[PDB]
């Protein structure tokens, strides 16, 4: 190993936030093997990407322009304003024109072919054989009434992304020797026993238990648990799952290892505890806290895996089963039917989840048939990719390598635009794989290595988990380290900049929190210190300029200490504001950023990403709802950063305006506020139209997700009329449609108007459009719960969204169902809003 090979690794370590060379917390070599595993996939992707297209990372889409953005072009001409230090001619361009082509009507329009269109003030480029209509920046401008400003500069040097050079028919059994903990005490001395489970996709194949013994600091069984399953019948991916009840602790051991060997010998496993179902319960990882943790002691002494058409009436049984939602439970009868008509089931892609849930993975012979089933995958391969279908196959119910592989195979066809919409959930999905090295992991790896925008967000999603998940940090760590070793020194440098900045600011964030009371107001002394610490940082600490983690196009510069401050909550976040490092920016506006420790922002990351998905759906059907899913990113334990949405105010503060009489409200302030922050009437109406759409979209999306019952506090509006929700960390009312909201639309307690009809129509249109993807939202929503909450109910909590999306009904009953929910809100009015407060005291 080189002397500067080890300075590389230690560089990596500090980016990663966890040291993958460490081997204190392993009982085998799976991770190191996975580090060696991923060297090929990486060096193939790095070896195959186009240096030029890679360096500029054009953000791009095949989807058609939606209806509602073509109406912003009633002339088949788009305006691009090219710049050059001072001057700038506005060039007239057809939606189908290529970057190279509109340089051909720029240079030819004057009277050297190696310049490039770069977005003014961002690290964004308009390049490669793509029609300008198909660039996200362009579409972004069209959606906002913004104009397309572009600067004529040089392509950046690919050299900046140089990657460096790297370097039996016996029944299974298991002796349970005993357990041992240093300190247990609670109050009374209860009994205790161990429960071993052979598991495969949350599915217990077999289960034994010890006699109970009294819970002393060391309990010793010296007992064989003979299982019914046989060695050969054990399927790759099967977890020996040891648990301790008196349910206190758990730990898992793969029974077949990353080399197909049968796990044999002595193991002393350090167990996880339960904070008194979710994805943590599955992890192959042991508890690294060897000093406080409970530990179980086992021994394994036990290589392997070495015509007729249907009578049209059962077909209708099948087809009804196939027609049911992912959280519909399959009865035994269902499964015997599905399985017996394998080859008929195979002709329906949507059937696969339900079909492979009907495999008996506890028998070599049936699995061997399941493998033969998959061998003829001609209907699947040719099928159109369905994301929700494909996801279902990657959740916690499917531990089979090949079942899982076929889903990954379908993802291959996603373009980056789409990978980006699902990346976070695809990352969380890695928690569901049995082995560290998996098709899914090599895919994520490969797609972020292929495109810097995905790479960037891969990083932060991986690092979010590493920083706070004992259960999955080691695995992610290995995946991340795989990536860093091929993202190229350009970005290695950019990530280092970002890690430093956020490390500095979290120090300041947490340091400030101590200084103020747990809850009351703003100490002048705290505003005094904050201003010093940031003046301290600004000089000989803070990197000249960093990329904004949630918006890597934007390079932040120096702070605006004058504008930075501590917020007026109970956790004490930092309103921070930054100059923009790019001097070609068209504007003077600041990069706003909030920094917060106290809420688990991972939840907020996830909910925001759904919102983003919902918008991509409404994009398919020519709908625009003006959701404002702001940037939000986790960085560590109960901590991270949030995008500041310029010009937004709290609806609550709009009622605190005068008095806010501990919980009084007044209807017309919201419309009155809008008039004030509108110069014309023209811009005021444009607000009411936006408030109508935003109000609609947040009403629908929030209702679907169960998070619709919120306070005015956690809801904001921009000056330009765009309502939005904040703060998704964990009588009743479905969504906020308070009498103030209805007033802006032009109504007050049981009446109708030209704009209220518009709201109703949109919600309905919008609501319906989500239901077209019912399956997708359900699988997301359920994955969400499992990988991103405390503990939860694998049926009940999920069940809500099923009821919500009004599963199994017809468009009219839905139209009706939601139109009832509206009517609930106009009946309650303030009664719930006013309630928060009543409980404070
Ligand atoms: C007087 S003061 O100290 O200067 N300050 C003025 C602003 N006011 C209200 C706000 C609260 C709030 N909370 C969150 C938030 C978001 C997520 C989360 N998990 N937790 C909290 N996000 C906010 N957005 C983010 C979007 O862009 C605008 C700012 C806002 S604005 C408080 C007092």
UniProtKB/Swiss-Prot annotation:
Activated by both the alpha and the beta-gamma G proteins following stimulation of G protein-coupled receptors (GPCRs). Activation by GPCRs is assisted by the regulatory subunits (PIK3R5 or PIK3R6) leading to the translocation from the cytosol to the plasma membrane and to kinase activation. Inhibited by AS-604850 and AS-605240. Transmembrane segments: none annotated. GO terms for biological process: adaptive immune response; angiogenesis; cell migration; cellular response to cAMP; dendritic cell chemotaxis; endocytosis; G protein-coupled receptor signaling pathway; hepatocyte apoptotic process. ATP binds at residues 592-601, 627-635, 724-730. It is found in: Cytoplasm; Cell membrane. The modification Phosphothreonine is found at residue 774. Residues 307-486 form the PIK helical domain. Residues 706-714 are annotated as: Catalytic loop. Pancreas, skeletal muscle, liver and heart. Candidate target in therapy for inflammatory diseases. Selective inhibitors and protein ablation are anti-inflammatory in multiple disease models such as asthma, rheumatoid arthritis, allergy, systemic lupus erythematosus, airway inflammation, lung injury and pancreatitis. Phosphoinositide-3-kinase (PI3K) that phosphorylates PtdIns(4,5)P2 (Phosphatidylinositol 4,5-bisphosphate) to generate phosphatidylinositol 3,4,5-trisphosphate (PIP3). PIP3 plays a key role by recruiting PH domain-containing proteins to the membrane, including AKT1 and PDPK1, activating signaling cascades involved in cell growth, survival, proliferation, motility and morphology. Links G-protein coupled receptor activation to PIP3 production. Involved in immune, inflammatory and allergic responses. Modulates leukocyte chemotaxis to inflammatory sites and in response to chemoattractant agents. Belongs to the PI3/PI4-kinase family. This is Phosphatidylinositol 4,5-bisphosphate 3-kinase catalytic subunit gamma isoform. It comes from Homo sapiens. The gene is PIK3CG.
